[PDB]
Enzyme design. Structure first.
Site, PDB file in Angstrom:
ATOM      1  N   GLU B 107      -8.414   6.298   8.162  1.00  0.00           N
ATOM      2  CA  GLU B 107      -8.718   6.269   6.727  1.00  0.00           C
ATOM      3  C   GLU B 107      -9.643   7.447   6.390  1.00  0.00           C
ATOM      4  O   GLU B 107     -10.620   7.708   7.102  1.00  0.00           O
ATOM      5  CB  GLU B 107      -9.354   4.913   6.348  1.00  0.00           C
ATOM      6  CG  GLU B 107     -10.163   4.899   5.054  1.00  0.00           C
ATOM      7  CD  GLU B 107      -9.305   5.100   3.795  1.00  0.00           C
ATOM      8  OE1 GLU B 107      -8.404   4.269   3.543  1.00  0.00           O
ATOM      9  OE2 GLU B 107      -9.546   6.087   3.069  1.00  0.00           O
ATOM     10  N   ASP B 156       0.095   3.705   4.779  1.00  0.00           N
ATOM     11  CA  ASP B 156      -0.423   2.934   3.653  1.00  0.00           C
ATOM     12  C   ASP B 156      -1.312   3.857   2.830  1.00  0.00           C
ATOM     13  O   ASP B 156      -2.532   3.728   2.827  1.00  0.00           O
ATOM     14  CB  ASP B 156      -1.200   1.700   4.165  1.00  0.00           C
ATOM     15  CG  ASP B 156      -1.812   0.862   3.032  1.00  0.00           C
ATOM     16  OD1 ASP B 156      -1.361   0.970   1.883  1.00  0.00           O
ATOM     17  OD2 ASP B 156      -2.766   0.107   3.304  1.00  0.00           O
ATOM     18  N   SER B 157      -0.675   4.790   2.127  1.00  0.00           N
ATOM     19  CA  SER B 157      -1.391   5.844   1.421  1.00  0.00           C
ATOM     20  C   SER B 157      -1.342   5.583  -0.060  1.00  0.00           C
ATOM     21  O   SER B 157      -0.466   4.848  -0.558  1.00  0.00           O
ATOM     22  CB  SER B 157      -0.707   7.178   1.655  1.00  0.00           C
ATOM     23  OG  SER B 157       0.546   7.205   0.971  1.00  0.00           O
TER      24      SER B 157
END
Ligand SMILES: NC/C=C(\CCCCCN)SC[C@H]1O[C@@H](n2cnc3c(N)ncnc32)[C@H](O)[C@@H]1O
Ligand SMILES: NC/C=C(\CCCCCN)SC[C@H]1O[C@@H](n2cnc3c(N)ncnc32)[C@H](O)[C@@H]1O
Lengths: 281, 281
Positions: B107, B156-157
């Site tokens: 992240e 998961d952007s």
């Protein structure tokens, strides 16, 4: 440029908005407030009592699924009733079927029909078809008095708050059952699985009292609240409405933008939480 | 009560709004503006650079489909990478798999992780799992340097405008391909079929240069623009990602609210217009 925003007690705490290129028409009919505007990115939009009824960009999703689900299952549909549907979207899709001999439409508000004929010519084109017969009446009353029975009834109604109030009850589904042929099918606008599970449960309960097979399908359409709306699917046989009996291969269907053979069945595959809620009805 | 409204050049002429019960937290991190509020009807909401990232009411739809699609197809996934996903939703779903031995998450914005741990405890609970390893870095750089290969990569952007800009290009998909095992799978957030067909075509084109099977699935989720968001699905075998190899029957999966065996395959049945657009890529 100003924005149109869609508020309702039927979806508290949320709103969808469209930027307005220009307002085209406004009136208070006998039944509801009517607003027509050109949006910046969704084409022309029809609004009834502050609720989006359709837009040019996405209406095909709802009109194709609502029509072609029952019409590909019914073997040789000859007589079809549309309840509501003044805009003509359902009728446009129905006219593609050469085998259809009669299409009755019972719309409560003649203003909607005439507005659609003026401002939405590509949606309302089906009214020119000689098979189409128009009734201006509350469908709750029409269905009490009709002598004919139908192969397919499509309940293209707005929300339970407003003139469509008379279409979301047990007595209405009795009238539908009786107005159908022994092997007839009904599909009805049945709200969003994300916010309307109470209504969905109620409607399924009404349908199950009379129909041997009651099923629910979901349609992706961005300009209805939560970006989806359901089809309540009612069959007198137990085979139901999940599996089409025909492929739409003739030239009239070459233009379809949403419906196909595979997504017909896919629409009935519901999220886990919804299956759990409706299991004991 | 005031309203939060979601505007972007990525969806011109439309906006979705949520009524605010109370604002909980706001900051400008190294990368983006962060807003957390309690909505009146959707629970707590995380907002990054004015874009809704998740809400409590519906996040399970996106997190379950993104995770369980690849994880039920991969035979014995041992090592999984999450790209983005600071909120922890994907990690929460991954931890349900006892066979998983390691979960790496890359992240870019550590503020997102810490905000999720404070304000979204039921989403961020997976960080307590001993198998989870956290990297604070642009995934574009992480993927260039990683020595390990993974069984599953979940991208998961957020959207292509912002820090996720480096994740929506050909070079990124080369890095993904190389960071996967010979039989590895990748799924990636891939926008709305209603408004982002250009992006979808571009992304499919990138994936097809390297992957032998590239597929696209749709998820119903009301608080992403147009009420849906897609999964770009990338396989090195030709069997692809449409058919699960296992049923999620153990106690850890009893809580699933969206994903099931049937809707896995259903998600890949796309509207006619989309199939037409992507056919010649
Ligand atoms: N084809 C998109 C239209 C609808 C779908 C919109 C869904 C909105 C989702 N929020 S509603 C279609 C029609 O139902 C009509 N109607 C409402 N009540 C009755 C009634 N009792 N009898 C006959 N017609 C009626 C409305 O006047 C409206 O024109
Ligand atoms: N689980 C719902 C979340 C997302 C889905 C939201 C979809 C929005 C639809 N409009 S986005 C998840 C994360 O991607 C992170 N991110 C963005 N760019 C990068 C990058 N280059 N490297 C690593 N992480 C990154 C963001 O900081 C964000 O926390």
């Amino acid at each position: 440029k100003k924005w149109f925003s869609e508020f309702s007690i039927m979806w508290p705490g949320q709103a969808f908005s469209l930027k307005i290129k220009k307002i085209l028409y406004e009136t208070k009919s006998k039944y509801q407030n009517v607003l027509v505007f050109e949006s910046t990115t969704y084409g022309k939009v029809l609004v009834l009592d502050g609720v989006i009824q359709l837009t040019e960009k996405d209406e095909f999703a709802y009109h194709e699924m609502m029509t072609h689900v029952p019409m590909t299952v019914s073997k040789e549909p000859k007589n079809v009733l549309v309840v509501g549907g003044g805009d003509g979207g359902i009728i446009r899709e129905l006219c593609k079927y050469k085998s259809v001999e009669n299409i009755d439409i019972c719309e409560i508000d003649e203003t909607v029909i005439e507005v659609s004929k003026i401002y939405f010519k590509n949606i309302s084109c089906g009214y020119e078809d000689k098979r189409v017969n128009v009734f201006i009446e509350d469908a709750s009353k029409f269905l009490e008095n009709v002598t004919n029975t139908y192969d397919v009834i499509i309940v293209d109604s707005s929300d339970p708050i407003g003139p469509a109030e008379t279409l979301f009850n047990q007595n209405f589904y009795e009238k539908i059952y009786n107005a159908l042929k022994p092997n007839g099918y009904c599909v009805a606008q049945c709200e969003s699985l994300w916010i309307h599970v109470g209504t969905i449960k109620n409607m399924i309960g009404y349908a199950k009292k009379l129909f041997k097979k009651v099923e629910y399908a979901n349609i992706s359409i961005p300009t209805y609240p939560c970006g989806c709306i359901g089809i309540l699917c009612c069959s007198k046989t137990d085979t139901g409405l999940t599996k089409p009996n025909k492929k739409l291969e003739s030239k009239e269907f070459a233009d379809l933008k949403y419906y196909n053979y595979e997504n017909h069945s896919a629409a009935f595959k519901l999220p886990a939480f919804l299956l759990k809620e409706i299991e004991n009805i």
